[PDB]
Amino acid sequence: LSRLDPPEAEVQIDRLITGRLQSLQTYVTQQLIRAAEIRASANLAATKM
Amino acid sequence: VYADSFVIRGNEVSQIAPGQTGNIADYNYKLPDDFTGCVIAWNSNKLDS
């Protein structure tokens, strides 16, 4: 923001924000997959109990 | 529709645009970042010089 003027800083911040949002989406998707796996594991554990 | 008129130097016309920096764009006439419209300029040496 300090070293670039608003026009180009806009697209630079848009690049950064797209990257970070995609990274967070990937993290949450992997977390959902792991949560489904752990749900299956917990169901098996309850059946065993 | 709003029509704003004025006279400036030749290369100084480059400051007439959204989000620009300079004497004019900062202390005389600043266009908004979301400006939609047109900027029309023509030489006036036969009139104002």
Swiss-Prot record, chain B:
Residues 9-11 are annotated as: Integrin-binding motif. It comes from the Viruses. Attaches the virion to the cell membrane by interacting with host receptor, initiating the infection. The major receptor is host ACE2. When S2/S2' has been cleaved, binding to the receptor triggers direct fusion at the cell membrane. When S2/S2' has not been cleaved, binding to the receptor results in internalization of the virus by endocytosis using host TFRC and GRM2 and leading to fusion of the virion membrane with the host endosomal membrane. Alternatively, may use NRP1/NRP2 and integrin as entry receptors. Binds to host ACE2. RBD also interacts with the N-linked glycan on 'Asn-90' of ACE2. Cleavage of S generates a polybasic C-terminal sequence on S1 that binds to host Neuropilin-1 (NRP1) and Neuropilin-2 (NRP2) receptors. Interacts with host integrin alpha-5/beta-1 (ITGA5:ITGB1) and with ACE2 in complex with integrin alpha-5/beta-1 (ITGA5:ITGB1). May interact via cytoplasmic c-terminus with M protein. May interact (via N-terminus) with host bilirubin and biliverdin, thereby preventing antibody binding to the SARS-CoV-2 spike NTD via an allosteric mechanism. This is Spike protein S1. It comes from Severe acute respiratory syndrome coronavirus 2. The lineage of its organism: Viruses, Riboviria, Orthornavirae, Pisuviricota, Pisoniviricetes. The gene is S. The chain holds residues 395 to 443 of 1273 of the full protein.
